[PDB]
């Protein structure tokens, strides 16, 4: 009994017996251990890497975000475009495009004007999807810092630094999303999978 107890305790008290409060080597060794633990825990929840799998919950960032990319399709279909106002504006467009001439073939600019109006609507669900994902990431960072409780002032700083970074990346992520929609308005490519010939 006593032999077993010494073996269990020995691996740790080997270090405690040499403690000196003025020991930069210990502080820096502790720093590298906490940072390596956080980066392993963080990757585990997002990427799924490692052999420690949580079989009770959903993984957090990994599968909450994976589902944000499958709630988002729902946001893109709640548009409710009024058919009657389309058919009116199509009619007025054709007549105004022909103008002073009677017209001989269906115009193209009518097709381009209608699409541009609907494409401009997508901006709303796209800026929601970004805010949803930012919120989920901040959550997973706050779970990962629960393991640094024995070090106050290091759980605060690591939260602040990783949190600030994720927020500042919001601006650049939204600009690219906006730009990818302007690209869609700029040119109407009808040689794609479309009603060719019709």
């Amino acid at each position: 009994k006593l032999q077993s107890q010494l073996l269990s305790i020995e691996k740790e008290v080997e270090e405690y017996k040499n403690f000196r409060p003025d020991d930069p080597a210990r502080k820096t060794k502790a720093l590298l251990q906490m940072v390596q633990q956080f980066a392993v825990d963080f990757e585990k929840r997002i990427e799924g890497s490692g052999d420690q799998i949580d079989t009770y919950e959903l993984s957090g960032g990994a599968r909450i975000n994976r589902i944000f990319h499958e709630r988002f399709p729902f946001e893109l279909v709640k548009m409710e475009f009024d058919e009657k106002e389309l058919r009116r504006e199509i009619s007025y467009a054709i007549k105004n495009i022909h103008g002073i001439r009677t017209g001989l073939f269906t115009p193209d600019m009518a097709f381009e004007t209608i699409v541009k109006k609907q494409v401009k609507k997508i901006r709303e669900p796209c800026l929601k999807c970004v805010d949803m994902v930012i919120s989920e990431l901040i959550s997973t960072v706050r779970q990962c810092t629960k393991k640094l409780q024995q070090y106050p002032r290091l759980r605060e700083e690591m939260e602040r630094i990783v949190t600030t970074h994720i927020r500042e990346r919001e601006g650049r992520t939204k600009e690219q999303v906006m730009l990818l929609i302007d690209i869609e308005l700029a040119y109407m490519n009808t040689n794609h999978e479309d009603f060719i010939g019709f």
Binding site: L2, L6, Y16, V35, Q150, L154
Partner: protein, 47 residues
């Protein structure tokens, strides 16, 4: 991340231990020494 954390000033206060750990390691040292003495006495009794 590691370079950012290290670069902050007052490294002696960033990594300060909580009072609970000072108690935990002090107790484990007393437990460790006490176990050795007890195992010494048993060895000197079996004889």
């Amino acid at each position: 991340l590691l370079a950012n954390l290290y670069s902050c000033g007052d490294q002696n206060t960033l990594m300060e231990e909580s009072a609970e750990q000072a108690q935990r390691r002090d107790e484990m040292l007393r437990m460790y020494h006490a176990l050795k003495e007890a195992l010494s006495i048993i060895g000197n009794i079996n004889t």
